[PDB]
Specification:
It is built from 7 helices and 7 strands; from the N terminus they run βαβαβααββββααα. The protein is α+β, with helices and mostly antiparallel strands. The chain has a single domain, classed as BirA Bifunctional Protein, domain 2, CATH 3.30.930.30. A hairpin with a 2-residue loop joins strand 6 and strand 7. The longest helix is centred in the middle third of the chain and has 19 residues. It starts with a strand and ends with a helix. The protein binds manganese (II) ion (MN) and sodium ion (NA). It binds a DNA duplex through strand 1, strand 3, strand 5, strand 7 and helix 5. This is Plasmid recombination enzyme. Belongs to the plasmid mobilization pre family. The interaction of the RSA site and the PRE protein may not only serves a function in plasmid maintenance, but may also contributes to the distribution of small antibiotic resistance plasmids among Gram-positive bacteria.
Length: 191
Amino acid sequence: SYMVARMQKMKAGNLGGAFKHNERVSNKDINPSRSHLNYELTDRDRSVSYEKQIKDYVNENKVSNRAIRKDAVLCDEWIITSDKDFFEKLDEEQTRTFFETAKNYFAENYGESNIAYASVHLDESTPHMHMGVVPFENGKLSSKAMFDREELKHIQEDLPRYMSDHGFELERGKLNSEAKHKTVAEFKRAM
DNA sequence: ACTTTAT
DNA sequence: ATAAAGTATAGTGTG
Ligand SMILES: [Mn+2]
Ligand code: NA
């Protein structure tokens, strides 16, 4: 099974949507009977939004006096998953451990303090986690500084190997992969 | 490498 | 006027 790890840039715009969905505040493949089974791995406050959480965090810690730019990348949302088969082999304890382990890799490489949320969805087709990493470093907020072409290449080699080192049996994706990413809607048509 | 942004 | 950070990026799956 391949390690699936992919990030999306999140602004003020789409963080409201991310928050209202990630909390189950519908889609055909959501089983509402199972939504009570989702869980959150950070110890964030359920009732505070992501925008409000991150904006306060950055402002309260940033070296510069200047305002966060309207078009700033407030966080990079990483989807952490694999395929059906992969999870089929694991029980509840181990599935939880898998996501905590991935969360760790991101804590250790980019700061435990920058994991805004870590939201595990067991009510869709395949267990996955929506994990918000705030690109904040040296008192500066910059996705550009933190996740560049090389960092993404690096993660594709390094994350899967770090997972396997903790007893999880997944291989890295195809190097120089030709694939274009499809949005979830696009990918459903494809099957 | 070039534009937008907030100074 | 200046300069940091905006633009994608790397990967596979029904996020
Ligand atoms: Mn989900
Ligand atoms: Na220009």
